[PDB]
Structures are given as structure tokens and as C-alpha cells.
Ligand binder design. Structure first.
Ligand SMILES: CC[C@H]1OC(=O)/C=C/[C@H](C)[C@@H](O[C@@H]2O[C@H](C)C[C@H](N(C)C)[C@H]2O)[C@@H](C)C[C@@H](C)C(=O)/C=C/C=C/[C@]1(O)CO[C@@H]1O[C@H](C)[C@@H](O)[C@@H](OC)[C@H]1OC
Ligand SMILES: CC[C@H]1OC(=O)/C=C/[C@H](C)[C@@H](O[C@@H]2O[C@H](C)C[C@H](N(C)C)[C@H]2O)[C@@H](C)C[C@@H](C)C(=O)/C=C/C=C/[C@]1(O)CO[C@@H]1O[C@H](C)[C@@H](O)[C@@H](OC)[C@H]1OC
Ligand code: HEM
Ligand code: HEM
Lengths: 393, 393
């Protein structure tokens, strides 16, 4: 009797038709996921937004419950699993050091990195795999620059962080040693920035103060690693998805070639339109009985709030299925909302603006080097994107 | 400048959002297929119906053209490769023998075969592969019945026919040997039926006459074996896809369990809704310059008419993306239209109605035996449906 969920087919970026049907007829409904408990699905923009910004919906039970999810393991911990007030303290300290200014300051280095990755693609010659060569490379190198990892070490961060990808084919024993080595490096680097501060993020976290608090050694170390993981896969996938769309939606490519000044606005409109997630935001749990648009969610029931479906909700975005690079307003939920709203978002926007800008500067004739019927899509089951994008230009 | 086409991915039944965009803004557009010549893609119901019904679009050049298509080899020949008047002669004789009345008379043996397969499937315990044990078994056995293959040879016949499926893992030599034996067998049976007529279809085809004309020895053979192939894979795949939908859409399962008399209507509505083909109907070729929606289609250009998109057109079907078993009217194009309209359609309706009726009658708790997200999909590249459907009940 609950619907089998996810609805989205991972082999592509198409929004499941069942969402539009639910948004009209059963905006809060019962779903059964591949693993974990039955849950409530929330689909409309107002409701998704209410849920994510209502402190009555918490994340803390995720530490002990059998969470609704697509994969048999549970991934627990980090900032996304924490509730106010301990969440709030870490976040206040991180957003103090990790500011929009600091994001903006990395644009010139992000462009240099993107151009170097295109040079390497030019050198290997066509067709070249935009996924392996650019999308999987840029986000992790940019995050290494943000944190302050010396560039001599960026190659091997890339290799370690690759073990933490939901698409990775690694043994659990290889992934564990990748994690031990990553942590050991970062703990060492935090210790070097303590004794001798630089202008990088690790130094600024070591010395951030709020009221009278500061991050502890372990907090620093978890938060640095977390930012790397949080920052990598989601950015890589969304680059791969945006290029894929530029290659398959010709009116969109033409527009941004004609008017590159529309790129920042195009990044917001694609973040809105691409239903990136296979399913929803990580489950929230009702702290007490709450009524949501006539349906009572009892205390402790999990809620799956779809930002995907929300961002395509006709009541909020007129002609919601149209990509309109000049759409205003565009208050989308693609970076979340409320206390857990993406703290990487100013940087992710810079990376996505730079990726588009540079790719269209360098490879304006870019297109798929294979038929779409032969694209391989990711079956990681967390985000939707291509495994390889062979391109010609 | 042409888009790559097909847009659909093979691994599911998702209808590409680009189809709706083209239906609104570019209902006749240039595309490039994975193999063969560039072509015109037609997507509105009116237009696809007009193409398929209009004698100016012929199939004869398929015999010598580099046809737009999804697999490297070409499958040419059979009735579908013919034009009036030779097509007309063959068809008139076939539908003389192969009547709606003959197809209905097979309902009670189809039910018996279906119960037998349910019994065999139940005996292998749960979970059971609904595809291998039921969907790939019913259509070929019923075509065997239709033709008058004696029931003792259905198992061998099923093994030969199996070699012709687009999913088949056979070598070239294996497929040739299967064809050669299937030809000799069918040859032998035709001769046996000429000497001693029975009430089966092979007998009716030997005896059928029209304006004093009749089928030759070679024609009969190729029509007989042609009916087996046209009738096997498509009905098997549509069984699999209908049952997959019933197991994943609980309200649809519920309505048909409550009201089995809705089944006929449901088979129509699902035939409409399911974009069974990866791509379009096989290409038609304009005999002379034709205008279609104000775009000039030059003589000889291939024309890809998407019955998948047509059946999903909002201009024809209110709420076209919604499955409504009581949809009326439902003038869908899932069995083609015009002179090459599916001539097995009455029998396919019988098989699909029987497949639903017997499974829901015997296994009313049937449901997936693994998460939908873990289903494996066919990569035959022609029709879409699951490779395997582990079920429990
Ligand atoms: C897809 C991105 C997402 O990926 C993840 O959640 C990472 C998932 C991988 C698959 C995990 O590794 C697997 O663990 C299994 C026990 C064995 C698998 N192999 C060995 C066979 C192995 O691959 C986790 C456990 C890996 C470790 C290093 C980890 O904790 C990674 C965390 C990273 C989380 C993320 O990078 C960020 O988390 C996501 O952030 C989004 C913004 C949230 O919306 C949400 O997205 C779905 C949330 O997803 C759970
Ligand atoms: C998707 C359904 C479609 O299947 C097909 O079209 C299936 C075609 C498969 C994919 C082909 O098999 C491949 O051939 C390759 C050269 C090698 C591959 N292996 C060995 C690596 C092999 O798998 C073709 C060649 C199979 C042969 C036996 C064949 O001619 C099959 C024809 C079957 C046609 C169909 O079963 C039905 O299509 C029929 O096509 C005829 C040509 C038409 O006249 C018409 O039949 C009346 C039409 O039905 C309405
Ligand atoms: C296109 C790229 C990105 C997308 C689409 C994205 C999306 C999101 C979303 C939707 C959330 C909220 C999840 C929820 O509430 O369930 C989130 C949180 C978060 N993001 Fe991102 N993100 C991206 C890039 C980044 C980057 C580059 C970083 C770091 C540099 C980052 C760091 C984080 C962290 C640490 C959280 C947890 C915040 C908290 O719980 O307080 N993200 N992101
Ligand atoms: C659900 C199963 C079936 C579906 C969805 C289906 C669909 C179709 C379609 C859409 C066409 C027209 C294709 C075109 O014009 O390009 C066609 C043709 C054809 N069908 Fe079927 N069909 C099915 C079952 C059957 C069966 C059981 C038989 C045999 C008894 C059969 C025999 C044929 C033949 C011989 C043709 C070619 C007709 C001609 O060219 O004149 N089909 N079918």
C-alpha cells in the first residue's frame, strides 16, 4: 500500500511523472524505500521548505534508526546528522572562517585549474572523457586550494577522495586505508597551520572564535575532512550534469555562448531544474505530532522532503519544467534550506560558474562523441549523473 | 545541428521530457540515429497517425537504404518491409485465415497455458523469475497453438524461438542452426496440413483464397515463421512491462483485483502508456516531396514516427502521463495504424488480458522480490523491459 520509492529512474535526469501527480493529489504520502523504514514523502515546494526550516524536524534519530535509504549501508555522522544546539555551534564557527568572500577569492585559481584540465584533454586528443578528466578533477582540487593543501599533494588527495565516491569500485579495506591516510595527512596539516598560520581555510578554522568557543582538535579534523567529502561528489556530479545538458539541449548552449554574462543566472536555473538526487533530502524525524497540510506526522516518523520535486513545483515556478536561464525570482531548494543549508554553496556556485565559463571558452563546439543510447549512467543510487562523457569538439 | 536520437534510455520505461518539448515547439525535427542516415523525427499524435496512414510514406527503400536504427546490423524483409500492391495481396490472404474470431477462440487455451506456467513457477519456490518462467513462455506457446504445432513440440519450439530474441546470448552459428531447424520443422508441418487439413491457422493459410489467388509454398513458410517472431518478443516484453507496472503501482493493482472486468480496458490504457520502443516505428520514406506541419520532407528522406510520444501527447489524451484504466476514448497507436497495423493485435489483446487475469487470479499478492532500484533492464536496444523480474507472493 505505500508506493515503492524512489520514483526517479537513475538512467538520466528526467523528473519522474509521479511527482506531478502527487503534487496535485497527495502532496504528503507513504512510500516504501529499498532499505529502512516506511516514510512520509513531501513534494510541494511550500511543504519541503517548511519541513527543512522547521526545528520540529530533526536529524538526530538518524544515529540509531533504520533509515529510509537506497543502499544497504548506513552513512552516519558529520554535520548533517547533528541537531541544534551542537550543530549550531560548529556551523557558527565554520561559517565565520568559510565566508562568501573567501569563496569568491578562489575564482582566479579555479579558472586556472579548469584551464589546465582542458589542456590535458586537448593533449590526449578526442574523444576525451569529460567525467574522468575534468568533472572528477576540478572540485577536489578547488577544495584542496580552499583548505590550503600544498598543490604538490593535490594528485594524491584526488586519489584518496576518489575512494569515498558512491561510484567507486574499491574494497572496504582499500577505502579504510584511504580514510586513515587522508585523516593522518590532515591532522598533520592542521598541526602545521596551528604553529605557522597562512591565509588558507584550515588556518582560519584553527583560529576562529565565537563568543568564547573554538573548534577542538578532533572537530577541526572531522570538519576539514567532511568539507572535502561534502564538497567533492555533489559538485562533480552537477558539473557532469550541466555539461551533459549543454551538449543535449542546443538552445541552452547557444544562449550561453551568445551571452556568457548569463552563466551565474544559468547556474541557479540549472541547480533548480536538475533533480540531482535519486530520492529526497536525508530523512527528518518529527520531534512531536505535527500536522502538515491536513496529514498528521506522529512523533518519531521519518519525513523524506524532495527538493527535486519541490524545485519543479508549478505552484512555485511558473512553467516549472522549462529551463529559463533568465528566470527571476529563483528561490530554489537545490542547496537546501534552514539550519542545514549547504555551507559550501558560495564556493559551489563559483565552481559551477567557472566550469561552464571555461568549457564554453575552450571547447565551444563540445558535444557527445557517442550516441545517447550508449551513455553509461551511475548506479551509485544517491545522485544521478553519467559515469563517462566522451566528448568531441 | 540534428539532435542525437533516441532520447530514451533503455533501462526503464521513462518517457524522455524532450518529446513533450518537441511536441510543443518543433513537432517535426532533424535527428541523428546511432547507425544509418539522418532523418525526420515526428512526435505529435495527429502527425504520427497521418504518417502511418498515408500512402505517400512507403517501406520498400528499407531493403536497400542505410536505415536509421539503434543496432549495427539491419533486420530487413518480412511483411513490414513491403508496399502495396505485393503487401496488400499477402495481408489480405493472412487476415482471411487469421480472424478476430480465431483469436478469441484461443482465450480458453491461453488461460490453460497460463495456469500451467503459474504452477511450474510456484514449484521452483520463491522468489521466481517472472520473465523466464512466465513472460517468455506464454506468447510463444500460444503462437504455437495458433499455428497448430502439436503440443509435444512446444518446448523445442520455444528453445528455437529463443535464439531470435534481441536479448539472446547466442552465437551466429547457434542462431543459424535454430533458424534452419525452425524452417525445416515449419516446412514439414505445412506439407502435413496440406495433405490433411485441421482447424488450425497453418491449415487456414494453405486453404485461403482471394479473387482466385492463394499463398505459395515459400510465402506460407515465411508468413508462418514471420508470425512466430513478430508475435513473440513484443508480447513477452509487454507482459513483463505490464506486470512490472502492476507490482509498482498499488492503486492500479488494487483496482484490477477489485474489478477484474476492468482488465480489457487496462490492457488498452497500458498499451497506450508504455513507451515500449527505445525509438520510433521503423522508418517510412516519402515517395515525393511532402509538407508535414509546414516542413518540407523531400522524396526519399527517412521519417521516424514515434508512437511512444504520440500515445503520450497532451493534445490527444487529457492528462497523458497518467495511467487511468477507465480512459475513454483511447484511440492509441501502440498497435500501429494504416496498412501495416499489427495483424496480431486481436490475439495480443487476448494474451495480455489472459496474462493479467490469471496472474492476479492466482497470485493476488505478487510483488517484487528485490528493490525496484535493483532490477536489471534489457539492452537489446529495440524494446524496453526487464531482463528478470524476481517475484514473491
Ligand atoms: C553522494 C554524496 C555522498 O556520498 C555518500 O554518502 C558516500 C557513499 C559511499 C558509497 C559509502 O561507501 C560505501 O560503504 C559501504 C559500506 C561499502 C561500499 N563499497 C566499499 C563496496 C562503499 O563504497 C560511504 C560509507 C563512504 C564513506 C567514505 C563516507 O562516509 C562518504 C560520505 C560522503 C557522503 C556524500 O559525499 C555527501 O552526502 C550527501 O550530501 C548530500 C548533499 C545530501 O543531500 C545527501 O545526498 C544524497 C548525502 O548523501 C547520503
Ligand atoms: C524487437 C522485435 C523484433 O526483433 C528483432 O528485430 C531482433 C533482432 C535481433 C537483435 C537480431 O539478432 C542479432 O543479429 C546480429 C547480427 C547478431 C546478434 N548476436 C548473434 C550477437 C543477434 O542477436 C536479428 C538479426 C535476429 C534475427 C533472427 C531476426 O531476423 C529477428 C527478427 C525479429 C524481429 C522482431 O522479433 C519483430 O519485428 C519483425 O521484423 C520483421 C523484419 C518484420 O517483417 C515484422 O515481422 C512481420 C516485425 O514484427 C512486426
Ligand atoms: C553542486 C554542488 C552542491 C550541491 C548541489 C549541494 C547541495 C547540498 C544540500 C541540498 C545540502 C543540505 C542537505 C539536507 O539538508 O539534507 C547540503 C549541505 C552541506 N554541504 Fe553542499 N552542495 C554542493 C556543494 C558543496 C561544497 C563545495 C561543499 C564544501 C566546500 C559543501 C558542503 C556541505 C556541508 C558540510 C553540508 C552539511 C551542512 C549542515 O549540515 O549544516 N557542499 N549541500
Ligand atoms: C503486445 C504485443 C504486440 C505489440 C505491442 C505489437 C505492435 C505492433 C505494431 C506497433 C506494429 C506496426 C509496426 C509499424 O507499422 O512499423 C505491428 C506489426 C505487426 N505485428 Fe504486432 N504487436 C504485438 C503482437 C503481435 C502478435 C501476437 C503477432 C502475431 C500473431 C503480431 C504480428 C504482426 C505482424 C505480422 C506485423 C507486420 C504487419 C504488416 O507489416 O502488415 N504482432 N505490431
Amino acid at each position: 500500500e505505500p508506493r515503492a520509492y524512489p520514483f526517479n529512474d537513475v538512467h538520466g535526469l528526467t523528473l519522474a511523472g509521479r511527482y506531478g501527480e502527487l503534487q496535485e493529489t497527495e502532496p504528503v504520502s507513504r512510500v516504501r524505500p529499498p532499505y529502512g523504514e516506511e516514510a512520509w514523502l513531501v513534494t510541494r515546494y511550500e511543504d519541503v521548505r517548511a519541513v527543512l526550516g522547521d526545528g520540529r524536524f530533526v536529524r538526530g534519530p538518524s544515529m540509531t534508526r533504520d533509515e529510509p535509504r537506497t543502499r544497504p549501508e548506513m552513512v552516519k555522522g558529520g554535520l548533517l546528522s547533528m541537531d541544534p544546539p551542537e550543530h549550531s555551534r560548529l556551523r557558527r564557527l565554520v561559517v565565520k572562517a568559510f565566508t562568501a568572500r573567501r569563496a569568491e577569492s578562489l575564482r582566479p585559481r579555479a579558472r586556472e585549474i579548469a584551464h589546465e584540465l582542458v589542456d590535458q584533454m586537448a593533449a590526449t586528443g578526442q574523444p576525451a572523457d569529460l567525467v574522468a578528466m575534468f568533472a572528477r578533477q576540478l572540485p577536489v582540487r578547488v577544495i584542496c586550494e580552499l583548505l590550503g593543501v600544498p598543490s604538490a599533494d593535490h594528485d594524491r588527495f584526488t586519489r584518496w577522495s576518489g575512494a569515498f565516491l558512491s561510484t567507486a569500485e574499491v574494497t572496504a579495506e582499500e577505502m579504510q586505508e584511504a580514510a586513515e591516510q587522508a585523516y593522518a595527512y590532515m591532522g598533520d596539516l592542521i598541526d602545521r597551520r596551528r604553529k605557522e598560520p597562512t591565509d588558507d581555510l584550515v588556518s582560519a578554522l584553527v583560529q576562529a572564535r565565537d563568543q568564547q568557543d573554538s573548534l577542538s582538535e578532533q572537530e577541526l579534523l572531522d570538519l576539514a575532512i567532511g568539507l572535502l567529502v561534502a564538497g567533492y561528489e555533489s559538485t562533480t556530479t552537477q558539473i557532469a550534469d550541466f555539461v551533459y545538458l549543454l551538449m543535449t539541449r542546443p538552445e541552452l548552449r547557444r544562449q550561453l555562448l551568445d551571452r556568457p554574462e548569463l552563466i551565474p543566472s544559468a547556474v541557479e536555473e540549472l541547480t533548480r531544474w536538475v533533480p540531482l538526487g535519486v530520492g529526497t533530502a536525508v530523512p527528518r524525524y518529527a520531534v512531536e505530532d505535527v500536522t502538515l497540510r491536513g496529514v498528521t506526522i506522529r512523533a518519531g516518523e521519518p519525513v523524506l522532503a524532495s527538493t527535486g520535486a519541490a524545485n519543479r513545483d508549478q505552484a512555485q515556478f511558473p512553467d516549472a519544467d522549462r529551463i529559463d536561464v533568465d528566470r527571476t525570482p529563483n528561490q530554489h531548494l537545490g542547496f537546501g534550506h534552514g539550519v542545514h543549508h549547504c555551507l559550501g554553496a558560495p564556493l559551489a556556485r563559483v565552481e559551477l560558474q567557472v566550469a561552464l565559463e571555461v568549457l564554453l571558452q575552450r571547447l565551444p563546439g563540445i558535444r557527445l562523441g557517442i550516441p545517447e543510447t550508449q551513455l553509461r549512467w551511475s548506479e551509485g543510487m544517491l545522485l544521478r549523473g553519467p559515469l563517462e562523457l566522451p566528448v568531441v569538439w
